[PDB]
Amino acid sequence: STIEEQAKTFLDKFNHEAEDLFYQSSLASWNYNTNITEENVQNMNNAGDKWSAFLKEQSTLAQMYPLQEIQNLTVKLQLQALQQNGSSVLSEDKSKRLNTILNTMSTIYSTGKVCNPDNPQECLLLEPGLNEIMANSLDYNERLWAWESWRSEVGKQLRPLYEEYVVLKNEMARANHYEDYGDYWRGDYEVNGVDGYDYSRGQLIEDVEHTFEEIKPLYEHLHAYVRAKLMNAYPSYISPIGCLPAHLLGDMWGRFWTNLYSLTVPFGQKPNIDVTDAMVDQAWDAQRIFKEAEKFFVSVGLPNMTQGFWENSMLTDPGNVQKAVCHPTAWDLGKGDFRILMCTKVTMDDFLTAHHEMGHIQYDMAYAAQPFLLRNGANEGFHEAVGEIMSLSAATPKHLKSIGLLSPDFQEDNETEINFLLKQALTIVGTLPFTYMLEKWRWMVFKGEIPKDQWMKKWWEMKREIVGVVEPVPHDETYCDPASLFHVSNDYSFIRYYTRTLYQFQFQEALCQAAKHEGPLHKCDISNSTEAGQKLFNMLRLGKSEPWTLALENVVGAKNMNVRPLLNYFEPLFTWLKDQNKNSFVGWSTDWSPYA
Amino acid sequence: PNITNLCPFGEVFNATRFASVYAWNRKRISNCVADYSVLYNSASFSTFKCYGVSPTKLNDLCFTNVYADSFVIRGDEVRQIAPGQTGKIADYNYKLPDDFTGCVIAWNSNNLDSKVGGNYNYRYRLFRKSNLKPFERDISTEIYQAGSTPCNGVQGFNCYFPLQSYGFQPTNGVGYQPYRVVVLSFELLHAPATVCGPKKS
Ligand SMILES: *[C@@H]1O[C@H](CO)[C@@H](O[C@@H]2O[C@H](CO)[C@@H](O[C@@H]3O[C@H](CO)[C@@H](O)[C@H](O)[C@@H]3O)[C@H](O)[C@H]2NC(C)=O)[C@H](O)[C@H]1NC(C)=O
Ligand SMILES: *[C@@H]1O[C@H](CO)[C@@H](O[C@@H]2O[C@H](CO)[C@@H](O[C@@H]3O[C@H](CO)[C@@H](O)[C@H](O)[C@@H]3O)[C@H](O)[C@H]2NC(C)=O)[C@H](O)[C@H]1NC(C)=O
Ligand SMILES: *[C@@H]1O[C@H](CO)[C@@H](O[C@@H]2O[C@H](CO)[C@@H](O)[C@H](O)[C@H]2NC(C)=O)[C@H](O)[C@H]1NC(C)=O
Numbered sequence: 013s014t015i016e017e018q019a020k021t022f023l024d025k026f027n028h029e030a031e032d033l034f035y036q037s038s039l040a041s042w043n044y045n046t047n048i049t050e051e052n053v054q055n056m057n058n059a060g061d062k063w064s065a066f067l068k069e070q071s072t073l074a075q076m077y078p079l080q081e082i083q084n085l086t087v088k089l090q091l092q093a094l095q096q097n098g099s100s101v102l103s104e105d106k107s108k109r110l111n112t113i114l115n116t117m118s119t120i121y122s123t124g125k126v127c128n129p130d131n132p133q134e135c136l137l138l139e140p141g142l143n144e145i146m147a148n149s150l151d152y153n154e155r156l157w158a159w160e161s162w163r164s165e166v167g168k169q170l171r172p173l174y175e176e177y178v179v180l181k182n183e184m185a186r187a188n189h190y191e192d193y194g195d196y197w198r199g200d201y202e203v204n205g206v207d208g209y210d211y212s213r214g215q216l217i218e219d220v221e222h223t224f225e226e227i228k229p230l231y232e233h234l235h236a237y238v239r240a241k242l243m244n245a246y247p248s249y250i251s252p253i254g255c256l257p258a259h260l261l262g263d264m265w266g267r268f269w270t271n272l273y274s275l276t277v278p279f280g281q282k283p284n285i286d287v288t289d290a291m292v293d294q295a296w297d298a299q300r301i302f303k304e305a306e307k308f309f310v311s312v313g314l315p316n317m318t319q320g321f322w323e324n325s326m327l328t329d330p331g332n333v334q335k336a337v338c339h340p341t342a343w344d345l346g347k348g349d350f351r352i353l354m355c356t357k358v359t360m361d362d363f364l365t366a367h368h369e370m371g372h373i374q375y376d377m378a379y380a381a382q383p384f385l386l387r388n389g390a391n392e393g394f395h396e397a398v399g400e401i402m403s404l405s406a407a408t409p410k411h412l413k414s415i416g417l418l419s420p421d422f423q424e425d426n427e428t429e430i431n432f433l434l435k436q437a438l439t440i441v442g443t444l445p446f447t448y449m450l451e452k453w454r455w456m457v458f459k460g461e462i463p464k465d466q467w468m469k470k471w472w473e474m475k476r477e478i479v480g481v482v483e484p485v486p487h488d489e490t491y492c493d494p495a496s497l498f499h500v501s502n503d504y505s506f507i508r509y510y511t512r513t514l515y516q517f518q519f520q521e522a523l524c525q526a527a528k529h530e531g532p533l534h535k536c537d538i539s540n541s542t543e544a545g546q547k548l549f550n551m552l553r554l555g556k557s558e559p560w561t562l563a564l565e566n567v568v569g570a571k572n573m574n575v576r577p578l579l580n581y582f583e584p585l586f587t588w589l590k591d592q593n594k595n596s597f598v599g600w601s602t603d604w605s606p607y608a
Numbered sequence: 609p610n611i612t613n614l615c616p617f618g619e620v621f622n623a624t625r626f627a628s629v630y631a632w633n634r635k636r637i638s639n640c641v642a643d644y645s646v647l648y649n650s651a652s653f654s655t656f657k658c659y660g661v662s663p664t665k666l667n668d669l670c671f672t673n674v675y676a677d678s679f680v681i682r683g684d685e686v687r688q689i690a691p692g693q694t695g696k697i698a699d700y701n702y703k704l705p706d707d708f709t710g711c712v713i714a715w716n717s718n719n720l721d722s723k724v725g726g727n728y729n730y731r732y733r734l735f736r737k738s739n740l741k742p743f744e745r746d747i748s749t750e751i752y753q754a755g756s757t758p759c760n761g762v763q764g765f766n767c768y769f770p771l772q773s774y775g776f777q778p779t780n781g782v783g784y785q786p787y788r789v790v791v792l793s794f795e796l797l798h799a800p801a802t803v804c805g806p807k808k809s
């Protein structure tokens with residue numbers, strides 16, 4: 013008999029018995045996260061340690077099949093996931109050292125404490141407090157002190173751990189047929205099957221800046237406008253020639269500029285569209301909010317929501333001693349079980365979060381028919397983009413008026429539209445250069461172009477060039493600034509957030525085009541459009557069975573990743589900014605610094 | 609005539625315990641008056657899907673030696689019980705002929721055959737050397753060789769156990785909760801017919 017038959021029998025044996033164990037682990041995790049008792053901790057530990065202790069043998073057995081003779085693609089693609097060494101390529105000592113390094117790095121990051129100089133006994137943590145200080149405060153000196161204290165009492169001891177971590181993980185990757193760890197991360201964006209849809213690991217590198225160079229003028233104009241407004245702000249600090257400092261952005265790292273909205277409102281007098289008071293006045297509970305969110309998807313055309321979601325899921329207000337961590341999550345426990353978890357309150361942000369999580373649930377429900385190993389998105393960027401599309405499309409004034417929240421005789425004009433566009437831009441488009449620079453730095457350091465001595469300095473001039481952020485105070489070699497980040501100290505890839513925005517805007521533009529809408533793109537709505545729902549479903553149902561290049565062929569007409577929809581969305585904002593700052597100049601000079 | 613003689617459908621529909629699909633239960637029914645009206649009007653039954661005989665004319669027809677086969681399967685697999693159908697249990701566990709003249713009833717049993725820890729007492733056949741002939745029952749439990757080497761009844765490489773259990777749980781969604789299925793077969797051979805419905809006066 014052929015090898016393919018043996019592989020098929022092995023897969024059929026494996027998946028059915030894996031499903032039940034995965035379901036048990038998911039149920040234990042749900043019980044722990046919904047009811048925090050001591051018993052649940054060890055129950056989850058002893059009901060999940062078995063899942064890996066079972067996956068190990070299945071991975072071990074899936075090597076006697078010589079994966080260069082299998083055909084039919086789908087079988088080979090399914091078997092590719094199983095044939096993963098993981099971290100077993102190395103001996104016990106190196107593996108346990110790496111695990112201990114990860115654990116100690118996580119513990120150091122998660123227990124940070126910095127004390128103000130006058131009281132060395134009352135410290136502050138990254139929890140609200142120090143974060144609150146750098147979020148919603150006004151003093152220059154205290155912001156600078158908090159920045160320096162956090163970067164000098166957290167990331168100073170991380171340098172040796174990260175230095176050993178880099179070489180250890182690079183050695184593991186080289187043992188796993190990848191010359192860098194950057195290749196190991198980029199392997200997700202790789203397909204070597206059908207001809208005409210193929211994609212290589214190194215192509216993403218050439219693609220990232222190719223699609224980044226087109227949005228540079230927009231970022232430059234936003235930088236110029238924000239710098240001008242900050243010059244109307246804190247005096248004798250900003251320079252009208254250079255680029256703005258680091259600790260004045262409005263966050264610990266400057267990942268998001270949302271906290272900076274208050275200082276740089278275009279008009280100010282015009283109030284934003286907020287319906288929290290209207291929602292309260294009509295006595296709206298969580299059930300009403302979730303039913304409206306379900307009706308939106310039903311009107312679009314997606315399948316109706318199943319029973320048990322309204323029963324098993326913890327929708328709202330745990331209340332009494334029954335404590336529960338309630339970061340808003342959507343759980344896919346398997347075996348046709350879907351749930352949500354949230355502490356719902358009466359506020360607009362809760363409405364948007366409910367829509368986002370419901371979209372996540374819909375996408376999870378779409379591909380339930382695929383085999384066990386292929387129940388994910390085509391790549392790591394599709395899932396969050398699909399989730400955020402509904403949030404983008406559910407905040408339009410027309411949709412709010414249709415559900416009877418805004419006044420029926422409401423009229424929108426130039427000022428409020430520009431205000432909303434600026435508010436959304438400050439969050440969406442102000443983070444792309446930061447992510448691009450961080451990922452470029454990580455790839456470069458993994459490849460080893462920058463040696464041990466050229467770590468912090470190179471990081472800083474690439475930040476000054478790409479982003480436009482200067483030194484409050486110098487750091488020579490004894491600090492590790494990027495290490496003081498959640499996604500860097502916990503070993504998480506960061507290029508997902510760059511592709512998510514482009515994917516979501518391409519999807520929104522395609523749906524609006526095939527939805528018969530006329531006018532500006534930012535006022536588009538996809539409610540009451542069955543064709544758009546059918547087009548979206550035809551791609552959502554695929555799962556991981558097809559390459560993401562083919563996935564970007566049913567929603568849009570081009571497989572490549574282009575950036576035109578972003579420049580189309582912020583068109584009125586760009587044309588207002590063009591005639592807004594007609595005296596100040598775009599661009600920055602990399603030589604001026606606050607301290608020199 | 610006068611007062612009729614009932615037929616025992618209670619012991620086949622309201623039995624406390626059914627049997628796994630790989631050993632589906634068979635019962636023969638003869639010399640009785642069967643009333644299908646109470647079965648048709650019942651609202652509990654989800655699937656009442658029978659082809660060769662019109663549902664409203666069961667009482668008019670008169671057959672001999674009716675058969676009833678009962679088992680318990682998964683929700684998603686109820687579509688596999690039909691003439692000219694293919695799947696996993698249709699060709700390995702229970703196969704119907706292409707000239708079927710019978711009637712299949714299926715209903716939900718989530719609150720009877722489920723347990724909070726899981727009901728692991730239902731098993732089905734997953735690996736066979738070849739397909740199954742119509743109305744054939746196989747209970748052989750022998751190790752399966754998927755390669756070109758003897759297995760000697762030990763679960764080694766490419767040597768699998770043929771029967772695999774079920775994982776029913778109370779919180780599983782529709783399509784995984786257990787369903788109970790019973791099929792009625794109406795044969796008509798040369799001996800005088802005895803089994804058919806009441807003659808109203
Ligand atoms: C999507 O389509 C639905 C209908 O399929 C739209 O709902 C309909 O909205 C209109 C007004 O926009 C409603 O008409 C009004 O009804 C009230 C009574 O509810 C009446 O007092 C008014 O004089 C007026 O006739 C209509 O009832 C309503 N129908 C349903 C079933 O809800 C919905 O607005 C559309 N969403 C869009 C276009 O975003
Ligand atoms: C199997 O058990 C079920 C119940 O577990 C039997 O069905 C039930 O049979 C009783 C007795 O005839 C029915 O009660 C009657 O209902 C009528 C209509 O309301 C009423 O007028 C009578 O006075 C009497 O109360 C009952 O409705 C019926 N259904 C249910 C859901 O309980 C069934 O007969 C047993 N046998 C078989 C072969 O199914
Ligand atoms: C690879 O093999 C699988 C069988 O496991 C094929 O899947 C079946 O394909 C046929 C025809 O395309 C469908 O009618 C079936 O519904 C599919 N599923 C099953 C379970 O049979 C698959 O098409 C094959 N792919 C290639 C490229 O040969």
Ligand SMILES: *[C@@H]1O[C@H](CO)[C@@H](O)[C@H](O)[C@H]1NC(C)=O
Pocket residue numbers: 047049051334
């Ligand atoms: C949470 O766990 C405790 C510990 O067993 C238990 O007493 C309590 O009933 C649980 N909560 C709920 C809502 O069941």
Ligand SMILES: *[C@@H]1O[C@H](CO)[C@@H](O)[C@H](O)[C@H]1NC(C)=O
Pocket residue numbers: 075095096097100101
């Ligand atoms: C996993 O490691 C073993 C050595 O322990 C090696 O023989 C095997 O080929 C590796 N798996 C893959 C898929 O390369």
Ligand SMILES: *[C@@H]1O[C@H](CO)[C@@H](O)[C@H](O)[C@H]1NC(C)=O
Pocket residue numbers: 316317
């Ligand atoms: C969708 O589910 C709701 C929940 O009860 C129901 O009211 C509505 O009729 C359903 N719509 C369908 C099945 O088209």
Ligand SMILES: *[C@@H]1O[C@H](CO)[C@@H](O)[C@H](O)[C@H]1NC(C)=O
Pocket residue numbers: 425426427
């Ligand atoms: C918005 O700008 C256009 C462009 O001239 C103008 O015609 C219109 O009156 C403006 N609307 C408001 C409310 O200012």
